[PDB]
Write an enzyme that holds these catalytic residues in place. Structure first.
Site, short mmCIF file in Angstrom:
data_model
loop_
_atom_site.label_atom_id
_atom_site.label_comp_id
_atom_site.label_asym_id
_atom_site.label_seq_id
_atom_site.Cartn_x
_atom_site.Cartn_y
_atom_site.Cartn_z
N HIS A 7 -3.27 -2.87 4.06
CA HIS A 7 -3.33 -3.53 5.36
C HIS A 7 -2.50 -4.81 5.42
O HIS A 7 -2.61 -5.65 4.53
CB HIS A 7 -4.80 -3.90 5.58
N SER A 41 -4.07 -5.69 13.28
CA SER A 41 -5.46 -5.69 12.89
C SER A 41 -6.37 -6.28 13.96
O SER A 41 -6.44 -5.52 15.13
CB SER A 41 -5.73 -6.27 11.51
N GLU A 75 -4.87 1.93 4.46
CA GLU A 75 -5.64 0.99 5.26
C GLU A 75 -6.92 0.50 4.57
O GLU A 75 -7.42 -0.58 4.87
CB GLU A 75 -5.98 1.63 6.60
#
Length: 535
Positions: A440, A203, A327
């Site tokens: 995520h 990320s 996501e």
């Protein structure tokens, strides 16, 4: 010494360290925790580039994690592991520039390839000491040397008055760079091979890795890179100098504050005042946007990442990149009305339009109309379930999947050897609702091999699965190729290419090859939206 464990005593450029013998499932590992690599960035040092750690005397104790960098702590779902596992697990402090090393025990006799982890957290949070980043499994099972550092987040790491001397910007990236240099100089003392260093992060960590790829002085410090669910290009990873100047002076106002005078004033403010206000400087109501991120300074970054990837030479680069299946879902429950972890989050068309304005804060009305038209299921335009899932796909596509697809593309077209994956397994132990799918961040525990710990209640198949992932990752670090050079009974993982666009699925089933990373939809975000926006 003399009464101590002789396998835990090491010398680095700054002095002597005492590490710790840790228990991993299959045997002991060495851990050197909380090694300082910079002078504490406190007092007059706040906002300034890191200065190398000045040597100490005696044996520095490296048996415990050091302070986590001062940061906002999220308190939406208290006591809920879902959000807690990401929360700081050591004391908050500006004195936080420390790093950690895991090696086999006893340390390797020949030089071993090094993995360097760079955590995410939106550039406003994160720490290397979290349980999901525990390096003992990779070190014990794969024999890897694993390094991870703290770097400054939020204002402390990213507040910039571009052009100034006192707050140049990107100092959090510079913290990361200083640690890469520390690895180059010192890792051999641990049996680590400075000539085989692979960066990996997830990320904002992955975005960070990308900055290093794009920043020349970082290039000599590593050989390969893995970007998990993040890219340097895209809507969130950077801001222009003008925009960073704006946010910095706004924040200055909010806390009671000529660049020199402004910065000096900021330096007299308690860390917590800055944290308490950092989120108030965003130009729009949004999700997946952060106040203080890397700035396009024309120094660390000489151009926008978009430019640099379009015109860069990536001949000698091996890159592994990927995304999780969902996501977008994680961010919906934080900032979009109608979404919750506690219900099925079936939303109306109205809330979908509102969600699109929030998830694409920079969009004109026409641009937001195009997004809505593209993502609407015109057979069931008002259907709550599709709308909820569409909203998730909008956020995840805009911010991660399409930036990744673009990055894989540009890199491949220009020399890099690229491998791409989509991670699709939802942990059996996952505390979020089914509708969120595989959110995520939830591949990380598998890549680090946590399921190998018996006390963690993963399934046996999840154990076998984590072992595959660890091999893909370490093979790639060893060689630039995820594939096992011997075992050919297992399906192969093809490089990603502009021509074929192949990537693999990562789940409990054997590798399966697919073509096109949301190609059709990503043509929308990557080729069309820019044009529509500037018009």
């Amino acid at each position: 010494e003399g009464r101590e464990d002789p396998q835990l005593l090491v010398r680095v450029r700054g002095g002597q360290l005492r590490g710790i013998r840790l228990k991993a499932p299959g045997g002991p590992v060495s851990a050197f925790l909380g090694i300082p690599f910079a002078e504490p960035p406190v007092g007059s040092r706040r906002f300034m580039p890191p200065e190398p750690k000045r040597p100490w005397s005696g044996v520095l104790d490296a048996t415990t994690f050091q302070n986590v960098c001062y940061q906002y702590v999220d308190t939406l779902y208290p006591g809920f592991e879902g959000t807690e596992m990401w929360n700081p697990n050591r004391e908050l402090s500006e004195d936080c520039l420390y790093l950690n090393v895991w090696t086999p025990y006893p340390r390797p006799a020949s030089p071993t390839p090094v993995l360097i982890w760079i955590y995410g957290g939106g550039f406003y949070s994160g720490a290397a000491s979290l349980d999901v980043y525990d390096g003992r499994f990779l070190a014990q099972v794969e024999g890897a040397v694993l390094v991870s550092m703290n770097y400054r987040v939020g204002t402390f790491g990213f507040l910039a008055l571009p052009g100034s001397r006192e707050a140049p910007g990107n100092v959090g990236l510079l913290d990361q760079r200083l640690a890469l240099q520390w690895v180059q100089e010192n890792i051999a003392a641990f049996g680590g091979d400075p000539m085989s260093v692979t960066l990996f992060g997830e990320s904002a960590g992955a975005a960070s890795v990308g900055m290093h790829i794009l920043s020349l002085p970082s290039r000599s410090l590593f050989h390969r890179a893995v970007l998990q669910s993040g890219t340097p290009n895209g809507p969130w990873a950077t801001v222009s100098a003008g925009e960073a100047r704006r946010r910095a002076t706004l924040l200055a106002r909010l806390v009671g504050c000529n660049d020199t005078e402004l910065i000096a004033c900021l330096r007299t403010r308690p860390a917590q005042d800055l944290v308490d206000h950092e989120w108030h400087v965003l130009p729009q109501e949004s999700i997946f946007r952060f106040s203080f991120v890397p700035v396009v300074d024309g120094d660390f970054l000489s151009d926008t990442p978009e430019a640099l990837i379009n015109t860069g030479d990536f001949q000698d680069l091996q890159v592994l990149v990927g995304v999780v299946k969902d996501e977008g879902s994680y961010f919906l429950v934080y900032g979009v009305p109608g979404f919750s972890k506690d219900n099925e989050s079936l939303i109306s068309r109205a809330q979908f339009l509102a969600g699109v304005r929030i998830g694409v804060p920079q969009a004109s009305d026409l641009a937001a109309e195009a997004v809505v038209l593209h993502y609407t299921d015109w057979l069931h335009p008002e259907d709550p379930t599709h709308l909820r899932d569409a909203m998730s796909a909008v956020v995840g596509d805009h911010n991660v999947v399409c930036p990744v697809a673009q990055l894989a593309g540009r890199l491949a077209a220009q020399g890099a050897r690229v491998y791409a994956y989509i991670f699709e397994h939802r942990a059996s132990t996952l505390t979020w609702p089914l509708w969120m799918g595989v959110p995520h961040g939830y591949e990380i525990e598998f890549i680090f091999g946590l399921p190998l710990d018996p006390s963690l209640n993963y399934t046996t198949e999840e154990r076998i699965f984590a072992q595959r992932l660890m091999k893909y990752w370490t093979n790639f670090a060893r060689t630039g190729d995820p594939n096992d050079p011997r075992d050919s009974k297992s399906p192969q993982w093809p490089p990603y290419t502009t021509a074929a666009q192949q990537y693999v699925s990562l789940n409990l089933k054997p590798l399966e090859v697919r073509r096109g990373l949301r190609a059709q939809t990503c043509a929308f975000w990557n080729r069309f939206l820019p044009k529509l926006l500037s018009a």
